[PDB]
Structure 1
Amino acid sequence: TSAVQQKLAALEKSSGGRLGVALIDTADNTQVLYRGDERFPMCSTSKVMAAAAVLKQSETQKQLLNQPVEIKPADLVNYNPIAEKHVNGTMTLAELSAAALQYSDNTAMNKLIAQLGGPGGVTAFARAIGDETFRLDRTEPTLNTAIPGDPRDTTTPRAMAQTLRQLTLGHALGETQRAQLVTWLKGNTTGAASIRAGLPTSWTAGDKTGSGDYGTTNDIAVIWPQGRAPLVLVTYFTQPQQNAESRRDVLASAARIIAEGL
């Protein structure tokens, strides 16, 4: 047990919930894990895997991101800030990917999942890039039920950090596609209160947040510290009661502990 792990344990104890953290520092490829091999509900952090899977498809179909997808009134789910503007029309796969990643649009995610042949198609892509832990079982919104002990729609912090590293900094995607994913993540609108709130302001980052029942509050980030090689950081958090409040501040606190420990 490390000093950073003990600080994370104290944060967890004061939070009332269960915290999972995985850091990869690409300066030396070392890792800091806290409950790194425990499963957590991914919620909208799973949108990264779906968008990446569509990017991979686009490597053999140059025009795929320009392909239209019909948005019908019946398609709208519980959080559709972009898709609601386009009902009875179409959005391209690029537009859907940007909406899913940067606005956390749940209808957009469902269209990505459908383009991959269902939740299992997203899982298949995870396996193809070496992630043997990730599982997507359901569509939006039920993938956010986040029931304690339920393996559906879960991963571990260790696995998600590795995957995010391979996707954004490694060679899981072609260069153009990797750059597009990074561009999308860096343009996220939802992240200022989560991991990035705990980082020095001079640093830059891209991230994808998630939230669900059981006060589940998540964030996954690729981070460029000032004068340092990039980091990948996953912070997952979930609580014992179904109607628990979101705790983005806990993710910010975890990130600050990690940053102060470098």
Structure 2
Amino acid sequence: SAVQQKLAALEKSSGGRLGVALIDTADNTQVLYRGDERFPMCSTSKVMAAAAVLKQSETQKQLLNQPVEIKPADLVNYNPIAEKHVNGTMTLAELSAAALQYSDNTAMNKLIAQLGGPGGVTAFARAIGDETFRLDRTEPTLNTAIPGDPRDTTTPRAMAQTLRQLTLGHALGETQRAQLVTWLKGNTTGAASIRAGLPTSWTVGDKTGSGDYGTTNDIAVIWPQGRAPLVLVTYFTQPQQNAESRRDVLASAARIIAEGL
């Protein structure tokens, strides 16, 4: 009830720019707020890169076990897992899990390199019907989040549709879809974001993102108790380059959505 009024009020109180896209797969209804505006994805783009490598592994059947060298010079600004394996190797499965569940930026860069560069991630998006997503840069510069810059952006509507196809539809093969869902459900970074606005009994798999301009993002698949899953994207960015993160705004958006549901 009055979901538009409530989301607009939350955005006004927050001082920033809020983008929401819900898909309720019980009946295919949607709730959209700035659903067609572009937002900087930051680490939520790791879902598209991991999924692209999963798709590659449908035909390169041992790809996920392939070792990748981690060198000291490869470390960027946030490498909680890769720093443990510097001067050694990680497999592409280990890199995918590190990217998704710890938001490891060096792991992201290895996924991007496996796909031939940022354009390889965009090409996979196009192959699964996403004409809006674009990845332009590697980590860490994909997080600059400059207002009006289309680089490394998507819209909430497009990201929600793609996350539905990846996790609940058939953009991936059955084993690969299950692997993506397993990884998202094991995320370590999400308890303050969409999850915090939802009943604790619900099952959530999500990927967070953060960057400059206080950009604070989360994209989630949600299995509510006793009903069909939801897909929810909450993107948020702020006027000041050095603004603080606002995961509470994402939780507040999710809580509004769960009320009107």
d(CA) in 2 for partners of 1:20 and 1:205?
19
Q: In structure 2, what is the Cα distance between the partners aligned to 1:58 and 1:6?
A: 45
Cα displacement string for residues 183-217 of structure 1 (whole angstroms, at most 9, x for unaligned residues): 00000000000000000011011000000000000
1:62, CA displacement in angstroms?
A: 1.4
Partner of 2:151: helix, strand, or coil?
coil
Residues 1:33 and 2:29 are matched in the alignment: no
Q: CA deviation at 1:61?
A: 1.4
1:219 is matched with 218
Kindly state the Cα deviation for residue 105 of structure 1 after the two structures are TM-superposed.
0.0
1:171-191 deviation per Cα after TM superposition (whole angstroms, max 9, x unaligned): 000000000000000000000
- Separation of aligned partners in 2, 1:115 and 1:135: 17
Q: Map Cα deviations across residues 145-175 of structure 1 (whole Å, 9 max, x no partner).
A: 0000000000000000000000000000000
Output aligned runs, 1:1-262, within 5 Å: 3-262=2-261
**Separation in 2 of the partners of 1:10 and 1:249?**
14
Helix, strand or coil: the match of 2:205? strand
5+ long unaligned stretches in structure 1: none
Q: CA separation in 1, counterparts of 2:12 and 2:231?
A: 24
Compute the displacement of 1:125 (Å): 0.2
Runs of 4+ in 1 over 6 A off after TM superposition: none
Report the RMSD for the aligned CA atoms in angstroms: 0.5
Instruction: Measure, in 1, the Cα distance between the counterparts of 2:4 and 2:58.
Output: 40
Shift, 1:112, TM fit? 0.1
C-alpha distance in structure 2 between counterparts of 1:35 and 1:211, whole Å: 19
Q: Output one character per residue of 1:226-248: Cα deviation in whole Å (capped at 9) or x when no partner.
A: 01100000000000000000000
Distance 2:147 2:3 in 1: 26
The alpha carbon displacement at 1:35 in A equals 0.1
Question: What is the rounded CA distance, in whole Å, between the counterparts of 1:115 and 1:64 in structure 2?
Answer: 10
SS at match of 1:252: helix
Q: Secondary structure at the match of 2:137?
A: coil
Deviations 1:94-114 (A, max 9, x none): 000000000000000000000
- For residue 3 of structure 1, report the CA deviation from its aligned partner: 1.4
Q: When the two structures are superposed, what TM-score results if normalisation uses the length of structure 2?
A: 1.00
How many pairs are equivalent? 261
User: Following the alignment from structure 1 to structure 2, what is the Cα–Cα distance between the partners of residues 207 and 250?
Assistant: 16
Distance 1:37 1:79 in 2: 30
SS in 1 for 2:147: coil
For 2:213 and 2:38, locate their aligned partners in 1 and report how far apart those are by CA, in whole Å: 14
Secondary structure in structure 2 of the residue aligned to 1:162 = helix
> In percent, how many aligned pairs have the same letter?
100
Whole-angstrom distance in 1 between the partners of 2:135 and 2:30: 25
Q: CA deviation at 1:6?
A: 1.1
1:6 and 1:144 mapped to 2: Cα distance?
30
What per-residue deviation string (whole Å, max 9, x for no partner) do you get for residues 44-87 of structure 1? 00000000000000000111100000000000000000000000
